[PDB]
Amino acid sequence: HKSEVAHRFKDLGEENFKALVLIAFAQYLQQCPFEDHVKLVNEVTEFAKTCVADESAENCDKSLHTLFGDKLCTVGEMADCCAKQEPERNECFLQHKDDNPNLPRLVRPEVDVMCTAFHDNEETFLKKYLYEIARRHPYFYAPELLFFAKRYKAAFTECCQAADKAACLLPKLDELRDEGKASSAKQRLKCASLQKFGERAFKAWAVARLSQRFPKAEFAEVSKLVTDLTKVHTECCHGDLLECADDRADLAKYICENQDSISSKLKECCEKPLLEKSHCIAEVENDEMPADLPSLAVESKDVCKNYAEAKDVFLGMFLYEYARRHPDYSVVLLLRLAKTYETTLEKCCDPHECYAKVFDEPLVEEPQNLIKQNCELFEQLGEYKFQNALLVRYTKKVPQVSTPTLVEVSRNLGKVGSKCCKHPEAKRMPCAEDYLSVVLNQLCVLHEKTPVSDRVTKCCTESLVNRRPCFSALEVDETYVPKEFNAETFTFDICTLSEKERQIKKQTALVELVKHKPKATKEQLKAVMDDFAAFVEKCCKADDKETC
Numbered sequence: 001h002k003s004e005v006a007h008r009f010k011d012l013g014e015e016n017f018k019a020l021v022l023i024a025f026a027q028y029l030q031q032c033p034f035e036d037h038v039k040l041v042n043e044v045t046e047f048a049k050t051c052v053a054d055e056s057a058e059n060c061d062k063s064l065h066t067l068f069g070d071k072l073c074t075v076g077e078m079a080d081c082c083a084k085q086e087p088e089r090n091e092c093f094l095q096h097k098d099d100n101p102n103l104p105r106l107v108r109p110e111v112d113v114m115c116t117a118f119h120d121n122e123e124t125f126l127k128k129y130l131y132e133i134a135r136r137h138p139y140f141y142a143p144e145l146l147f148f149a150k151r152y153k154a155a156f157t158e159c160c161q162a163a164d165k166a167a168c169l170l171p172k173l174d175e176l177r178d179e180g181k182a183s184s185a186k187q188r189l190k191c192a193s194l195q196k197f198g199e200r201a202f203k204a205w206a207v208a209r210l211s212q213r214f215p216k217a218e219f220a221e222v223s224k225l226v227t228d229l230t231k232v233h234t235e236c237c238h239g240d241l242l243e244c245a246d247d248r249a250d251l252a253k254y255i256c257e258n259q260d261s262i263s264s265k266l267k268e269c270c271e272k273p274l275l276e277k278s279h280c281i282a283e284v285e286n287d288e289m290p291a292d293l294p295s296l297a298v299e300s301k302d303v304c305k306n307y308a309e310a311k312d313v314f315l316g317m318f319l320y321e322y323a324r325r326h327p328d329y330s331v332v333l334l335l336r337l338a339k340t341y342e343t344t345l346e347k348c349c350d351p352h353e354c355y356a357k358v359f360d361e362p363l364v365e366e367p368q369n370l371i372k373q374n375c376e377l378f379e380q381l382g383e384y385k386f387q388n389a390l391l392v393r394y395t396k397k398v399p400q401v402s403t404p405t406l407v408e409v410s411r412n413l414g415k416v417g418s419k420c421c422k423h424p425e426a427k428r429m430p431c432a433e434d435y436l437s438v439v440l441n442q443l444c445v446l447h448e449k450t451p452v453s454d455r456v457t458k459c460c461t462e463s464l465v466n467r468r469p470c471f472s473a474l475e476v477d478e479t480y481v482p483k484e485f486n487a488e489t490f491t492f493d494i495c496t497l498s499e500k501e502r503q504i505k506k507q508t509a510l511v512e513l514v515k516h517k518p519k520a521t522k523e524q525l526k527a528v529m530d531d532f533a534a535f536v537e538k539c540c541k542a543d544d545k546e547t548c
């Protein structure tokens with residue numbers, strides 16, 4: 001339409017619009033109180049209704065960026081992003097998006113406290129959810145956040161009328177919260193690939209993953225879906241959230257109305273309501289690959305004639321054909337195979353006798369031996385021992401990395417052994433390798449915020465695919481001569497916290513111990529980690545309390 005806001009408002013409805021806009025505000029200005037934005041959002045919503053009645057009305061033709069930026073610049077904690085033209089302002093807000101914004105961790109009130117607030121003002125409760133999530137996750141998938149919001153509303157609507165509200169609601173919120181971090185982590189990688197590597201980098205990745213999942217589809221179908229997807233995530237990762245959710249609603253539409261040309265596993269995904277549609281398709285299982293499929297063609301003579309007539313379309317089709325056949329090959333491995341074949345086709349183009357042994361070119365043996373060998377060690381140590389085993393070997397590599405970043409990163413890295421070492425041989429690499437680069441991007445984004453090491457940054461700026469191999473061969477930091485002591489930190493209130501929170505601290509000290517004593521042997525190191533745990537347990541099981 002002529003007016004932009006009215007088009008989105010109509011398509012999405014007032015409910016989603018209101019939610020989508022609020023999420024937009026919370027992700028730009030992450031510091032502003034809950035109440036102050038709510039005021040801004042409703043003003044935009046109320047104004048949105050003006051343009052719906054009549055698009056000709058003043059200020060309606062304005063772009064979504066302009067309208068949003070104007071109402072935000074109305075609220076020493078001043079970066080001063082209110083800097084003239086919209087190409088500058090919006091990109092400014094995008095620039096300032098704090099991955100780790102430093103906000104108090106919200107504590108979870110008692111079940112009875114939360115249920116009553118749900119009966120008082122149910123609207124306010126759900127808004128505070130979108131608010132607090134969008135603040136601490138500025139690169140969260142907005143339309144995926146709307147889905148989680150509804151599920152949040154379902155848990156309270158169901159449990160708070162139960163006999164035992166605490167046994168119902170708590171298992172779920174913990175479940176929702178785990179999925180929250182996962183949905184956030186995964187979506188940050190999609191924004192990193194785009195904004196730090198390029199649209200072609202995102203297209204390539206998308207082609208590969210889709211191909212494995214919709215192998216029954218023709219090439220241009222997947223090619224279509226890649227274009228449509230890239231446009232959704234680009235909109236989302238750039239603040240244009242309204243266009244993001246709107247397109248994604250349209251994306252699922254065109255998909256469910258063309259299932260037979262795409263996949264068979266969308267059967268009941270398209271049974272679920274509007275939001276539940278998008279979520280299902282995103283996670284949908286890989287469709288069975290068609291039987292009686294060729295391999296190659298045994299190299300063709302017209303290889304360089306077709307590679308020059310449509311390079312990307314060829315390489316894309318290569319990627320399509322190869323990925324659709326190998327559900328067991330990780331996207332990272334596949335992109336390596338696609339990049340090894342492209343450079344072979346660049347130098348060689350007697351071409352035939354040059355690119356004959358390309359498919360003979362080891363890239364596959366590396367991840368295989370990686371997963372098999374490590375899951376062995378993970379079975380030997382266990383999650384908390386493997387985490388601990390990694391916390392040392394990684395602080396060793398880069399002691400300069402802040403302890404918090406070392407902990408969470410190393411924590412989440414070990415958790416690979418719990419997630420993917422369960423699957424058969426075939427479902428490991430699509431699980432592990434993919435999940436690894438997600439956690440690896442966590443480090444990169446945290447590090448990029450407060451950088452203190454070149455080795456870490458070297459891998460992050462390098463090829464996204466080569467991140468893992470690069471990080472595994474950073475050697476051990478020798479020039480870490482200064483290893484200053486820490487008096488106050490070791491001094492352990494720690495007994496009112498959950499068992500999980502307790503271990504996290506015990507792991508915080510593990511890093512600090514190596515940061516003070518790098519060359520300290522793991523044999524004398526292991527002794528300290530056992531006693532320090534034996535001390536905390538002993539001095540709280542006793543009537544010492546806060547004296548020991």
Ligand SMILES: O=C1CCc2ccc(OCCCCN3CCN(c4cccc(Cl)c4Cl)CC3)cc2N1
Pocket residue numbers: 370371372374375378393394395397398401405406409410413414415416417432436443468469471472473474
């Ligand atoms: O913040 C820091 C400080 C500096 C630093 C240096 C190196 C580094 O290592 C990344 C490269 C190895 C990746 N491992 C490979 C093994 N892997 C694993 C775990 C369980 C099961 C399975 Cl199957 C597997 Cl493969 C976990 C991920 C991390 C850090 N991090």
Ligand SMILES: COc1c(C)c2c(c(O)c1C/C=C(\C)CCC(=O)O)C(=O)OC2
Pocket residue numbers: 186189190193201202203205206209229248278281282283434
């Ligand atoms: C498997 O998820 C990925 C990942 C991990 C990456 C990329 C990617 O495109 C997708 C597919 C995108 C999806 C499923 C959108 C969901 C929907 O369909 O609504 C990428 O380029 O970097 C990494």
